[PDB]
Amino acid sequence: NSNICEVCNKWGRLFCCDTCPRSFHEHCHIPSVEANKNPWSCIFCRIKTIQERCPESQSGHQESEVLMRQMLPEEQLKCEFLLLKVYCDSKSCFFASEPYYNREGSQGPQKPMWLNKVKTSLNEQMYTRVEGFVQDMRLIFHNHKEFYREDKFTRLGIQVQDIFEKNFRNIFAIQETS
Ligand SMILES: [Zn+2]
Ligand SMILES: [Zn+2]
Ligand SMILES: [Zn+2]
């Protein structure tokens, strides 16, 4: 097994996957690493199993159809994995915790949003469709762009949104387009 967390790339108290060489901090994995369960398989492994059990699940899909799916166990898992893929980027730090807004010439957003809030919401089963999760994720970046205006810090929102969107298209097998 790897000697650093797959998510944050630090050492520490790591739990090792039994079916692949990845390791995790307890609260870096999503869902948080389960108490017992020997063997234990990480989210990467669980996602790969879904794909392998239904090879056709990799054929292209329309975003509109994906968004209307109910959050049954497999879609819950896919959103958890998508959230984890964002935390895997170090620039996620900017979007993890609850923001505050006091900048001359700007007003804060009407509906603040942040990664840890989406994490809690997934954990508490507050989303009934994929759309709820994706709307909250996109809102994080949209709030940032609107607040920071022409400051070059707006680019951090663009950058992390691009990680989100690429992983969304991969995990949910969105039909490739020009
Ligand atoms: Zn970690
Ligand atoms: Zn694994
Ligand atoms: Zn099948």
CATH, residue 142? 1.20.920.10
- Structure-block tokens of residue 48: 């790969």
As beta bridge partners, residue 72 has none
Burial class (CB in 10 A: 0-12, 13-18, 19+), 88: middle
CA of 66 to the centre of ligand 3 (A): 17
CA of 7 to the centre of ligand 1 (A): 5
Residues 93 and 55 in one domain: no
**Method used experimentally:** X-ray
Residues 53 and 66 in one domain: no
Burial class (CB in 10 A: 0-12, 13-18, 19+), 9: exposed
What are the strands, taking DSSP E only, across the chain?
Answer: 14-16, 23-25
Q: Which domain range does residue 68 map to?
A: 60-178
Residues 92 and 126 in one domain: yes
Q: How many CB atoms lie within 10 A of CB 24?
A: 26
Q: How many CB atoms lie within 10 A of CB 44?
A: 17
Residues 106 and 169 in one domain: yes
The structural domain count of the chain equals: 2
Phi, psi of 36 (to 5 degrees): -105, -125
For residues 129 and 68, is the Cβ–Cβ distance under 8 A? yes
Residues 122 and 40 in one domain: no
Q: The domain spanning residue 19 has which CATH number? A: 3.30.40.10
> Whose atoms come closest to the Cα of 48: which ligand?
2
CA distances from 119 to 62, 76, 78, 83 (A): 25, 12, 13, 8
> Whose atoms come closest to the Cα of 59: which ligand?
3
- Structure-block tokens of residue 141: 């970046």
> Whose atoms come closest to the Cα of 39: which ligand?
2
Residues 110 and 51 in one domain: no
Residues 42 and 93 in one domain: no
* 145 CB-near residues (< 8 Å, 6+ apart): 154, 157, 158
- Structure-block tokens of residue 17: 């996957």
> Whose atoms come closest to the Cα of 56: which ligand?
3
- Structure-block tokens of residue 10: 């630090």
Residues 53 and 89 in one domain: no
